[PDB]
Structure 1
């Protein structure tokens, strides 16, 4: 009837080869509309980075639905359509009230976007009684819940113990349950079942 589901990720992380995981790192061309401080009028690219981009680096974003790994191809859009894209001078509409210029900029973001059901690996910094901690790519902190752990496995004093009886170590394949961006930090919820 009524679709609010028009916000969804139709890109799915494909299971890679040679490997069993999926690539959640992705390049998204985007358009943002930002401000330019008056001091950077001689370094507009340099400014926008310091002014806008750089803070986004390695933080989650709702639009892209991931953590920003970095950016490529920053392009300020000259106000004049007539000017060829080669022109070294571009035009920035100044705010009527204030000296700050506002403009559109095109840039390519590399973003790691874990979805649900994605297959991932990560090292284990701590095996708790409740869970298993995971640094994903030595950055993203992931956790595997107790109930999510198959009950046949055990934890001793300490360290976990699998079905085969050994403790488990280091890189661990797991399936994503949820991704928690509500906290200041991303939290990747994986599951082994």
Structure 2
């Protein structure tokens, strides 16, 4: 009964699908498309188009944020298909409406795009902001990023500016382009905008 308790503890944290390296292009293919079953309500104002109603209320604000079930940041939707409550190939459907609220309950599955960074992978990043203890990295200029002071190598140093942000000097002493290789350490989205955290030592 010792391992029987941990059997449920291990099957709730194991990641489903991993993102390996591809083409040795530095970064990795981490944009996956997970089909998910979504249980939602409707609105009587959009009875002439229930798929457009849920698309406007429960799907447009849904994009570009991190959720808890699939554990990533959604990057679009596709496969809008609704399910009926009786065996049918006609366009007309039926939705079980709650006898309490004017809204009806529908259970429809849709394939949602999502991007999830693991712990110990490699990603891209451009130059966004250069502070004394925080560099700005924008992978695909959509996902913000931040770094602490203890995740940078000892050789990498910073030099402040005098004319008009902060300058940086690497180990050898030559600047590089905006295209920057980067690793992933932590993720946080409960703030305003999604922002990932990474390290520079492997």
DSSP-derived class of the 2:53 partner: helix
Contact 2:183 2:199 in 1 (8 A): yes
Aligned residues: 190
Contact 1:160 1:168 in 2 (8 A): no
- Aligned 1:93-132 pairs, distance under 5 A: 93-132=96-135
- State the 1:30 CA deviation: 0.5
Q: 1:80 to 1:136 in 2, by over 3 A?
A: same
- State the 1:60 CA deviation: 1.4
Taking the aligned partners of 1:92 and 1:79, their CA distance within structure 2 comes to 7
Q: Structure 1: where are the runs of 5+ without partners?
A: none
Q: Structure 2: where are the runs of 5+ without partners?
A: 1-6, 161-165
- State the 1:5 CA deviation: 4.2
- State the 1:185 CA deviation: 2.4
Which moved further from structure 2: 6-15 or 48-57?
6-15
C-alpha offsets along residues 10-47 of structure 1, whole Å, 9 cap, x if unaligned? 21111121412112211000001101101111101111
Which moved further from structure 2: 2-11 or 21-30?
2-11
- Aligned 1:60-139 pairs, distance under 5 A: 60-82=66-88, 86-139=89-142
Q: 1:95 to 1:4 in 2, by over 3 A?
A: farther
Contact 1:162 1:168 in 2 (8 A): no
Q: 1:2 to 1:101 in 2, by over 3 A?
A: closer
C-alpha offsets along residues 35-87 of structure 1, whole Å, 9 cap, x if unaligned? 110111110111110021111011111112111111000111111134xxx32
Taking the aligned partners of 1:61 and 1:2, their CA distance within structure 2 comes to 22
C-alpha offsets along residues 134-154 of structure 1, whole Å, 9 cap, x if unaligned? 011101001232221101111
Taking the aligned partners of 1:34 and 1:7, their CA distance within structure 2 comes to 26
- State the 1:175 CA deviation: 1.0
- State the 1:182 CA deviation: 2.7
- State the 1:166 CA deviation: 2.0
Name the counterpart of 1:21.
27
Q: 1:168 to 1:127 in 2, by over 3 A?
A: farther
Taking the aligned partners of 1:168 and 1:145, their CA distance within structure 2 comes to 21
Taking the aligned partners of 1:12 and 1:43, their CA distance within structure 2 comes to 38
